[PDB]
Amino acid sequence: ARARKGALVQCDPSIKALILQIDAKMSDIVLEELDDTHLLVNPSKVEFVKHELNRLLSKNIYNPM
Amino acid sequence: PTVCPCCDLMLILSTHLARSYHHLMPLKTFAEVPTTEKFRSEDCFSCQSRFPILKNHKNGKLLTSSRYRCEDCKQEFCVDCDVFIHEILHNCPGCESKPV
Amino acid sequence: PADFVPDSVSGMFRSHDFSYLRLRPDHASRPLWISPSDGRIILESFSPLAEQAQDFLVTIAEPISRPSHIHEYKITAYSLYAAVSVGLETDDIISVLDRLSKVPVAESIINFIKGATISYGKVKLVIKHNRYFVETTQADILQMLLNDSVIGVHSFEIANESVEVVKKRCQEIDYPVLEEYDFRNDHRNPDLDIDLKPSTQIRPYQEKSLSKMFGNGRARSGIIVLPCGAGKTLVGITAACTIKKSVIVLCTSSVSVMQWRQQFLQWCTLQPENCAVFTSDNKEMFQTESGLVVSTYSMVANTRNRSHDSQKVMDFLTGREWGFIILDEVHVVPAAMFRRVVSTIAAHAKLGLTATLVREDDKIGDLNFLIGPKLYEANWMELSQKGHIANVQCAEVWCPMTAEFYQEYLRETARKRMLLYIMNPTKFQACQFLIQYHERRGDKIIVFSDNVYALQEYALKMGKPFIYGSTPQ
Amino acid sequence: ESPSLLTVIIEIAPKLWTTFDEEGNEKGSIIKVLEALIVFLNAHLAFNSANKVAVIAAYSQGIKYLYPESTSALKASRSDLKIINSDMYRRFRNVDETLVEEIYKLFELEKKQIEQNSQRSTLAGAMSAGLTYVNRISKESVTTSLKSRLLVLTCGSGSSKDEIFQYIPIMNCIFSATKMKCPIDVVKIGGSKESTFLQQ
Amino acid sequence: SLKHSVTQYLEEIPQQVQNRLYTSPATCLAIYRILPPLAKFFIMAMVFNENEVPLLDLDKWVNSNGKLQFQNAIKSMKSLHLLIPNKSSGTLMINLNPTFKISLRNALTGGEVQNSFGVVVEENVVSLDLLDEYSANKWETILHFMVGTPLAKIPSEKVLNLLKHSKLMEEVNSTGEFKITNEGFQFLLQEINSQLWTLLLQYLKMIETSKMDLVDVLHFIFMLGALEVGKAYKIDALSETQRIMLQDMRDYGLVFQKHSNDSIFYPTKLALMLTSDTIPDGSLIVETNFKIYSYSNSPLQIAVLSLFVHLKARFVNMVLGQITRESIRRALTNGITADQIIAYLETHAHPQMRRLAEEKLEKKLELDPNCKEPLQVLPPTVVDQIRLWQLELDRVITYEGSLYSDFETSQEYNLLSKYAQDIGVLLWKDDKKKKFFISKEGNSQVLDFAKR
Amino acid sequence: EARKKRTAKKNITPYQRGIIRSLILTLDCSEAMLEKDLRPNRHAMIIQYAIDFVHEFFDQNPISQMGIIIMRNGLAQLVSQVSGNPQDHIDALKSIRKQEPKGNPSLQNALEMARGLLLPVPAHCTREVLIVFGSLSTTDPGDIHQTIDSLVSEKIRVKVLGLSAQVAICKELCKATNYGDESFYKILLDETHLKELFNEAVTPL
Ligand SMILES: [Zn+2]
Ligand SMILES: [Zn+2]
């Protein structure tokens, strides 16, 4: 019966593993590991999760010049 | 229209009779007006569309004018009215506007 | 610029705003747009005068891509060399481009056409008594080149190995090398009685490729790209029958050597006494004055200590002046020492036949100096809609990985990562479902996988046979 | 929904309207019919912005278009007479002014040519002209998906009986209007209750 | 849409404001022309009789297959307060609105109109070369600044703060610039008549000042709808709020005036096409290699193309572009959704793409007539790539709120979770993890429930 | 060219035409309608053009009656009796549109059943048979000149819209049944000309 600051996020298990490992890199991302589909990322770092998730998925994208 | 199944009598309507009067008497075709002939009107009779300059070439002037004079009422018609009066209609508005 | 002020939306065109070209009044009939920046040609195929421009553009240009409505072509130096080889000069090329283009042809494009087409055919490589000479019609062209002098009417002899160096240097300079074989007037090489059998029919795209090769009545060295099953082997047979000189065919495998020998003996009137095979098991040569030899790139370019009899066969191949070489799968020619097979064999005409003219390094462009310019490219969609090749439905099936496999994929190095994304169970399920569905549809299915362990695991899981390198023949 | 062309075939015969005035207590019923038609055409133009109006008058010696006026008169002209007030809606007001000026010109012309008496009614020819105008506007199609509708304002007045010679043209008009899906409305302002041909 | 939007606004207008609005004949004429055909037919059948009309007569007028449209027209007129029901002698009797009836009858027959259609001074300017050019210049200026091309000329600060107070045209001052929104690109999607109507409706929404009188504002708008292009009108027939809004519409481009504070003004072509509407420019070709060839010479359409197409070259007829990942992500980060991008591509698809799609559909129906497929005018490969880029933008969606856990008793967690489900702010719940989550707007209710 | 067309239409004369008609629409439905020289195939577009012909013929000639016979598998098949209701003929043509055309055509069998159908037709009502012939040869059970003579004796006028080329038996049948008039044997050129032929077939002879 306690209260905290957090933001729920929907993801497939691939993005779940990605945000868990970016939490392991920088521990101030997810408050707790929740389910295979739902997580609780930090509201002050939601935009950082967006930006670094796009950058980390950019290695899976072929970009012709 | 069907034959009566109880007394072997043919049952039609007035419109069923009238659908073939244009096959009985047809409309005489509209005459192409001469280019040098004096033109009665600048617009169609039953349509009042313009007859344009129709200069086919530089010195064509009023060559092959789009007027179609009727043989009876001497009224000029455009190409759309010439097709329409001979195909969809079957009667000449000039010939009926003529007060015989 | 034609005294035309930039518009408000000229900002995001990085000096590509070509609105200064005044539009012609009859631009609806003309199907072409000329880009002055890079020589790109934009063709509309739905307009009239479509194919009448398309043959002209495939003559003078290399197509980047040929979709349904709008085609793109590139004005290229090699394409202009092909145009002046087949007999189109600067005047009528510029005139037809001007008449067929909506916008006027720019002065930069006209000057590029003039510069590319001019100085053509001045330097030539000829082979005289198994010895490479380079010859110029003008005397000063010999004396102007002085940087790469590999010297050994006006002509001088170059070394056997330095032929590619000379060709690269003359491509860097504005004097490109002319490599065309006049097999009518070449009487010093012994002729062959090889000819096509009367029961052999040649498809129109094969005819177009061979017309590009023999357009001016002389055999031009170059590359023909045709899909698998489109008859590149038959194009090779027909080119050999057209040249009617001694033919050497270099393949990538011994089964390809056997196939090429069988295709010659099936489609053309070449005798088995005139045909020879240089492989591991077969090393006897034809005893006639001219004929066919089919061998492999590895056997020809084996710098290892080869056997005595194979050394004798190599001496025979080197000492003969060959009239025609067919390089099957020419994409492997730019390799480290597959490159030297075009030097160790002094052939007058060189035709490279392939389906896959790509390499993952930048050495694919060295084929213009090894074999010759890109003579012909088949339009695969046109062949598919004509029914010459199959109509394939290409699809990419996305298999979402499981959580455990993705975690392990993240916490491993690249070599384990490859096997770990190959071995995910979602691809098992998708492949098994597709196998079942197409087996119900009655299809012959080939499941390609380079990973041998993955191939074996999928085959044992699905109950289907597997073939890899260590399997017995 | 969709705009329409309302073509009004109005039979302004001096003989028939004089007999109607003599039968009724009032005089000059042509004015009342004409002003009711003017308000009705303004109503039709108020129904939709893009809809169109044509009027054809069938007088004693032929037919004449009332709105729009003849293009020869358009090229020659404009003496804007003050029958209709100028403070009303202009998009109705040009239509109304052209209609009333053509009414005045037609009445002046048949006052000049009043001596010739004809037994040949031109209602069928006017309806045929209206059908040709409907076909013309439908084929021109400057406004897409234009419907059309004929309204016939005729008067019997108990003087002219049923005319046999009109049977064939009215039947042909029926077939043409049925082909073009153009309804034909008939208003008969008179004493004789039955008009079989226009009823059909 | 257009008629639906103006009908919704006129329904939101209160009843006495509507009765004051029905004074001018031109406003009544425009409002009448908004109505559905059965409503219009009943209105004109009921104008010319001063006595009473029942609903039973109107219901007998309609056929059996048009009863739904009859109900739609009756509800539309009742919401617009053009019909007054009366309950006497057991029959629900209907009156037309008296002010609307008088004004419509005056507009039809001609009479007293208190210059609701203006006055003409017979001196004119050329419509196509000057009036259309001015109106087009103002519209191109407003849409060019709106799509964000570099402009030497920017519009007036009145429409600037209109655009920043509107739903579309987001703006930041940390960067100091404006962004096109989802409805901002939708605005470019519909036709310019509905664009002008939605701009005018948002302007009507934001005018709350005492300097603007709303009935006079709508009188001026519907009067401009009633007027004609190419001939002049006097300002002297207008009130002062209509004068200053004549200046505002001069800034917009709906009306042209030769000089500021002039006695004479000239309505433009947008004033007439405000009422109703009436290879093409901007028609574009899409290929499977994501190449775009757009037959557009208009800088507006080139600029709108640049919001999601990586432009490469430009000719007089057509522009070269390529639908690339970073350009589509630019549009998606600007909020232009994949559905409306594909809608723009369909609406500007080329007739040659149309006929090739027709040929493909003909071959598909002659091969497999059992199933029917929609007309795919543009390549499904590029359509699926656009939707896949939308999905790769929207891989994760974030909601912020509170999670209540560490409950020793499951009954209290179940009570809190069912309370959250009842108040409708719950997103997830589970007893196995003992966790339920709520939104930020729903945090306060559960917080006061737990505190009390 | 427009003046040449007007010259070709100048020959206008109020010919007396039989208004009350009894038309027998005979359609080839043999293997020759499997040819793909017409889009999408001969049988399907002849059925569709015949549906349009039924609508146009009953629009312009209401009083007239019509029956529908097809030629299939060496026999003539009646698909609708002679009646004045166009809806039954539309339904019959729609039913025949599904089935697959196969067999060898039989002009004699088609003409014999047409003669049987036109036998109870009254004398005031004209007797006409419009044959859409797709093949170039016909397989007859007996002599076809006897059938042609019987048609001439029964006063049945035959007009044939051929598809491929001019067949002499069809030309002689049209000539004999139309009293030396060789203009009643028509062969199409294009789809527009076939539509023009079906539109010409609705006017009274
Ligand atoms: Zn006309
Ligand atoms: Zn006439």
Coordinates of N, CA and C and ligand atoms in Angstrom, one line a residue, chain B residues 43-49 51 76-82 85, chain D residues 132-133 136, ligand 1:
Chain B
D43 N -27.6 30.6 -83.2 CA -27.7 29.6 -82.2 C -28.7 28.5 -82.7
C44 N -28.7 27.4 -82.0 CA -29.5 26.2 -82.3 C -31.0 26.6 -82.1
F45 N -31.9 25.8 -82.7 CA -33.3 26.1 -82.6 C -33.8 25.5 -81.2
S46 N -33.8 24.2 -81.1 CA -34.3 23.6 -79.9 C -33.2 23.4 -78.8
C47 N -32.0 23.9 -79.0 CA -30.9 23.7 -78.1 C -30.2 25.0 -77.7
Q48 N -30.3 26.0 -78.6 CA -29.7 27.3 -78.5 C -28.3 27.4 -78.1
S49 N -27.5 26.3 -78.6 CA -26.1 26.4 -78.5 C -25.5 27.2 -79.6
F51 N -23.3 28.3 -82.8 CA -22.6 27.8 -84.0 C -21.3 28.6 -84.1
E76 N -32.3 25.3 -88.3 CA -31.0 24.7 -88.2 C -30.8 24.1 -86.8
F77 N -30.0 23.1 -86.7 CA -29.7 22.4 -85.5 C -28.3 22.1 -85.3
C78 N -27.8 21.9 -84.1 CA -26.4 21.6 -83.8 C -26.2 20.1 -84.0
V79 N -25.0 19.6 -83.8 CA -24.7 18.2 -84.0 C -25.3 17.3 -82.9
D80 N -25.3 17.8 -81.7 CA -25.9 17.1 -80.6 C -27.4 16.9 -80.8
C81 N -28.1 18.0 -81.2 CA -29.5 17.9 -81.5 C -29.8 17.1 -82.8
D82 N -28.9 17.1 -83.7 CA -29.0 16.3 -84.9 C -29.0 14.8 -84.6
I85 N -32.4 14.2 -82.1 CA -33.7 14.2 -82.7 C -33.9 13.0 -83.6
Chain D
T132 N -34.5 18.3 -75.8 CA -33.2 18.6 -76.4 C -32.3 19.4 -75.6
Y133 N -32.9 20.4 -74.9 CA -32.1 21.2 -74.0 C -31.6 20.4 -72.8
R136 N -28.8 18.4 -74.1 CA -27.6 19.2 -74.3 C -26.8 19.5 -73.0
Ligands
ZN1 ZN -29.0 21.9 -80.3

